[PDB]
Amino acid sequence: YKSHQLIKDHDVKWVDLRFTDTKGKQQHVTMPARDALDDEFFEAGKMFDGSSIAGWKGIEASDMILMPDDSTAVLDPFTEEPTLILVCDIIEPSTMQGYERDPRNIAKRAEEYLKSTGIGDTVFVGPEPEFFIFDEVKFKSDISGSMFKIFDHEIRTAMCNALEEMGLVVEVHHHEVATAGQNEIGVKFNTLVAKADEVQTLKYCVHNVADAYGKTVTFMPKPLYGDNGSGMHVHMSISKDGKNTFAGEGYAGLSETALYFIGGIIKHGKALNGFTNPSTNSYKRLVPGFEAPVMLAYSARNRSASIRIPYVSSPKARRIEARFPDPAANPYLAFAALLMAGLDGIQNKIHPGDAADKGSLKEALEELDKGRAFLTKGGVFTDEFIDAYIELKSEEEIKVRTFVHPLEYDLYYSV
Amino acid sequence: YKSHQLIKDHDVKWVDLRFTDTKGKQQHVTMPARDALDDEFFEAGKMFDGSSIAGWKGIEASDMILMPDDSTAVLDPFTEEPTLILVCDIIEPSTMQGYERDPRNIAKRAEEYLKSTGIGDTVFVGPEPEFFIFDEVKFKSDISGSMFKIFDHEIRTAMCNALEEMGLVVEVHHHEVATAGQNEIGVKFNTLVAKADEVQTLKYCVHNVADAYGKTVTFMPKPLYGDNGSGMHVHMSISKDGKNTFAGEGYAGLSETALYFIGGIIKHGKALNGFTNPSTNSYKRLVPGFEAPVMLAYSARNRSASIRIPYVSSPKARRIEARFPDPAANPYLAFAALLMAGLDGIQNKIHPGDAADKGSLKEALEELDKGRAFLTKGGVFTDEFIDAYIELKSEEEIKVRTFVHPLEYDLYYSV
């Protein structure tokens, strides 16, 4: 176990276990390093009580065990004392299986289902998140009124260095390509679960580094009204014994398997928004007059299409690019939903039609409720989890819809 | 490759790839030094998306590749960490040729056309840009009103030192020769593309040094109403197997080839203003009662002519000096347009006439739209690029023409 060598080498004091909740926040706990020296630590885990977390309120969450994943052990750069960072999963003590409401468990089950189906062996995915940097931000809401107000190589190199030390392979750093204050950091693709963990670590590192310089950084889909929005493209492909199953001959060198994948994604697009755009702010984006994709179609050149086929000289690098997702989406759930939607299309050989050439959160939730059929396919998802998620998001939707806004005062106060 | 040697020597951390857009501004991206070691970098390039840039709104622009030019690799003096600067071109991955709307590609095509025509083997060009230095400057525009307001060996030595480290060859450094706050720095002439790149680097270095010393510097053609303007004289000549093809006998020892060159430039002068004077501010300079030229004529003594023949010790150094251009002009496009006009003059053997002895942006664009014929010879320019440029420059003219001005309030508010 890599943790033993790391601890022995760098006399670590504290161990930081981390796990993501339903909403997509990394909860963490800390322990002294003494316990980790026992293999029984990795064979049994540690008692935990997650009943207080938003998505897990219930009888089951009152008793759970955390199982560390030694594959992810690293050292923390920021702490003033040697600290060992680990990711963990949640296991039910009664049955020793992964908890039903764990996004990481859901993603692993999705990978297992893909492996069992025999369509392919592995899946490679690369996201392209994006964020904004500001000097200061203020906001407030109260019965009496509301406010929100907003107010180079140094920090860019600092972020790149921090990511490198944390163990990610940077590739490019786009700066203010579209509008002021917008940045993007590319990272090499990887497998599903590993890539999700990498996204979590990237967000954490960016937040800390930006804070250290007195700035602020945000991943909101659209923080400014009359400016460009922030998206997260997703490049994806499937591999079978070293063969790019998507690579082939046809439109843009795609195979019928890839075409069926696209057709399935197109068919289930409406349901996917419940996971790839789980925010009211998200739908401020996806509006005509900006870079956002407005038309649900696939094309190789048209910019308005929601699915694109980037040019790759080598057939080994054929991939599908989905444009609609947003940073607010939970990585595990979004990737699993996309994979399931594609596999559904493949299983029925749904022809996607001609390549294109020349909404709201409430509606998305309603669509998902009816379209839940394919997600439960193979037992990866469960209706219990789906219902809990739907209720959890509906609460926020209602909260937003029932409030009053200063624009209303401007428009109607005098009348 | 020189880049490999430099990286190995100085353990460079970051690579800065730079290019220019249609407006003449330098955009750049950064990468970790790792990926540049393998020759595959120089054999394939890196993916890029230029759709956001002003003049590259075409759909095909969504997926461009950047091809570095190893001949220009240098080390950055300013950056704290070792950084390797390179210039790049834009290639279309579908075809594997330079993108149509790339000014550097246009300049290279112009050089190739000259070589193929065989009138000469190479062309040497030297520009003479000026600039102004101020302590502070403020400006603002809004529906409620508009505003603009203005407010030594050390800095000159610093600028010269920075240029030398960056790799240029300074020759002379003037200082307040005609008006307060004006300066110019001579630099050794060179070939077309190399000289354009040198001009870009010169602008960058001057800006950085002036900022570092707490001043401000501007290349605006005429920032002050009552004072002189900033011109950019251009000296040029053509060489064929070591022979100064312009060197000859007759008026000022000039050959008939050079005389036809002058005649062609005179004939197409009105069209060239669309490139040599691409800003409305440019035509504030071109007015009587000042250093600026007035008449479209050539003379070795008359300082009011727009073309001149400097005295030279030997025929080897015979060259033609054009006065009307301004610093705002894009180097690549201006040089290419001048070269093509001269070549057309030579081809048609247009007699320039007698040596002289004793407008507006809208008009220039209109004239260019009809005079486009010669620019398209040999496929150096394309009508789509010309039309896009014309529209892009026309938008600014419309914006400036429609807006109100404080002088109007001064003149007419009481009437």
Added chain:
Amino acid sequence: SYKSHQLIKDHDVKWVDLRFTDTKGKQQHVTMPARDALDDEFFEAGKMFDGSSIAGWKGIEASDMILMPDDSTAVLDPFTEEPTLILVCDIIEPSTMQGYERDPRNIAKRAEEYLKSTGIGDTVFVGPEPEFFIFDEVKFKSDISGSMFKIFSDHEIRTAMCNALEEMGLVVEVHHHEVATAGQNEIGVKFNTLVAKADEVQTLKYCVHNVADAYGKTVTFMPKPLYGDNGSGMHVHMSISKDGKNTFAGEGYAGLSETALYFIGGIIKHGKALNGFTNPSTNSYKRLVPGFEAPVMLAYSARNRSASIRIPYVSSPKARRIEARFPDPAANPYLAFAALLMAGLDGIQNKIHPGDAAGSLKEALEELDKGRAFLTKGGVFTDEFIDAYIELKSEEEIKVRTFVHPLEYDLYYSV
């Protein structure tokens, strides 16, 4: 998923060092630059190697062999000036990608696999106790003119040795000092499995030699360096475990089970042949003489000191084991342990009853030659290797037997 990757990354190791043991029992080593080890294919393909010059491997095969590193053994060298990574290696025939016919480590691994297949048990636990001598200086010489050997004869050095072993990664338990005679020493180390313990013995020898040389003294492991003093030995404690249960533990003489009794009976029956592997030196039989601590009679006892097999008293059944007394440090660890294990397994399988509780190298080799039957059983040993080994030892046997010794000058010079 490799210790070596992390070690190299975290300690900027410059050099890698591959080690392997030959037939005689001496560790050969070869060095590499570190950069090559970072590729995963390194552990998949090994490195080409030519061992045809080694003593026991003289043959046609030995010209094309690959060293296959074992990542489990990676460590850092304490003694070297520059950071160096030590690895152990197996030998593979490129023809079949299988273990080499004559590799002691391969033989040991095959013996473990055969035990596992037999179904008698699951793992073997082995603990050796090699003694050794420390001296101030030693000289020796032999030539046609005569022969000579001469011997010239503390917390600090013992502490240094223990520290070095701890750094190299062993688990020390006790340090006996001059219990029986002046100059003799012993370091106890925790038991382990067969192959790992065999590797640990080699590391112990290396560390002891290096520390003794560093402090300016000399050290030896030979069975009997002095005529009047005691010899040195390797008591071997052995046990077999199945599903976490000590199979030897039971009700019987000294709390032994029928399995243990059959094991002992087999060892008793085959003891004559085992001497070929456990006592491979002529000097070994100088130790095995009456009147000292060495065993004489081939029997098993719980109290008698003359028996060659003992049943030490232990606190719990978990620790029940068998102690064999005759082996000596000159033996090759892999071959010795494998031979003992196979003899015991033959005893168990044939249900040989040991009875009731209480030579020369030439004869031992003859006995092994005629009794090889029980070693080839299961394919762990092969007649080709056995013949090669016998031929290798017979040369030394003859060379010692046919020489002229100084004592003969005392006895017969004047006769």
Added chain:
Amino acid sequence: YKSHQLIKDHDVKWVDLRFTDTKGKQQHVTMPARDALDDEFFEAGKMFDGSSIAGWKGIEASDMILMPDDSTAVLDPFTEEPTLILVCDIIEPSTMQGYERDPRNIAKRAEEYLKSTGIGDTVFVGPEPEFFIFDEVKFKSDISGSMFKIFDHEIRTAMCNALEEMGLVVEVHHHETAGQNEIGVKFNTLVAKADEVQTLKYCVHNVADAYGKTVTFMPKPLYGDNGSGMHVHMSISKDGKNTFAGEGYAGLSETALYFIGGIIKHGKALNGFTNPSTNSYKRLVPGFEAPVMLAYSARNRSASIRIPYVSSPKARRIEARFPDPAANPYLAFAALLMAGLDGIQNKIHPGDAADGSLKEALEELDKGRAFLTKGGVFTDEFIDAYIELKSEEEIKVRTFVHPLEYDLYYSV
């Protein structure tokens, strides 16, 4: 140019031009850095007089120009002051052509001839030269008598570090018997590999001298121990395809078989260039690793040509065992390549896989010079000069009086 950049960065003071003579020793000349900055330097070279060198004793050698090769510029680690090192070719002022007696020119012409022939596109060569390390050595010879007498990780790491600073890609360091060492270096093309061999020898000598020991590459320094050879792995590539790879004995193609057959047929003559020393024939005797039989096999040790096992078809190569470290690298590699090409062109069948003296070698080379002059890379003038040069050493060794004869015949 690489040299301009290097000088500008490291404010170099001195340039050092190096070349090799017929016997293989490397001559050098120093120069102030001022003149290297001019571009006319690399276009005109420097005037030189080589008439005093062993193999070039002719009227022609009065006026020669050294043409530096920019591709080889490096920095010296051993010098106190920053020094640049460049390799040079020799050009006749009369015709601006390479000098006939320049081994580097011969090697380059051999490469060009291969390219013209159309059989392939490039050659890959890897040598494996061994050497010996000793503590002290003495030797003397005069009318009154003759005599000679002979008397770790740190040093090996030092040599590897020095080679890395030079820019060689080290791969492995074999150690042992009783003082024998080998350092593996990644293969390369012909001329570059020859230059790398020269630099390896130079660095090893300097590093050993620094620690105070001594190092020798002579093929057999001791009577009772092993010798030192230079196994040579060779391959030919065409359009990125290993032409040797194919179906057949040990996975060899007909081209490889013809190559082997040609080498076998012309092996007797090759000894002139591959073993150009009397001492080198003390090694070629039965009872040691040295091969005696002139045949090819994949298993037998005594065969002179071997087909090593390899993982992929790309790495298929031919190994020649007989060559010797005393050989001049350029001449040796060129001779091997020409023998192989003659074999391929004439389609000589090697046969079936198995399962002298310098005087004789020189006579055989003189007799069979034909295959070397084909294509015009070697010239009868150079071959005659080389034979003439080696015959003096042969005679001088043959006609001397040796101490062993005193033991055998003094009392007879």
